[PDB]
Design a protein around this ligand. Structure first.
Ligand SMILES: [Ca+2]
Ligand SMILES: [Mg+2]
Length: 120
């Protein structure tokens, strides 16, 4: 299992920044916010989990982008952190950018991101 902490990734956008609550991680608030890093892959398919939370009782949605492809979105509804999963995602091998960003600007609340975990 490969786990990467959001707070150790590149943080970009107008608003995004490291957080300590509701965990050590990064918050994403508006469309151009992101976290990213480069991951080497030997295999073309993984299960991907992210621990995250919403800023509010309602929904925050986070796109997962691998090598520029939006492969799916994690739904974090409510203030309590959960682990959300995208299973059996195929992608390119070798060095690939991994990026997390809000799915919308106005459609959803803000996302808190703790870590990402890849597994086979
Ligand atoms: Ca973390
Ligand atoms: Mg927002």
């Amino acid at each position: 299992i490969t786990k990467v902490e959001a707070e150790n990734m590149k943080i970009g956008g107008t608003y995004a920044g490291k957080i300590s609550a509701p965990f050590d991680g990064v918050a994403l608030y508006a469309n151009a916010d992101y976290v990213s890093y480069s991951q080497y892959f030997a295999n073309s398919t993984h299960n991907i989990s992210v621990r995250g939370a919403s800023s509010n009782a309602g929904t925050a949605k986070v796109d997962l982008v691998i090598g520029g492809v939006t492969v799916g979105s994690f739904n974090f509804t409510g203030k309590t952190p959960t682990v959300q999963t995208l299973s059996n995602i195929t992608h390119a091998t070798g060095d690939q950018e991994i990026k997390l960003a809000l799915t919308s600007d106005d459609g959803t609340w803000d996302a808190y991101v703790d870590f990402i975990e890849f597994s086979l």
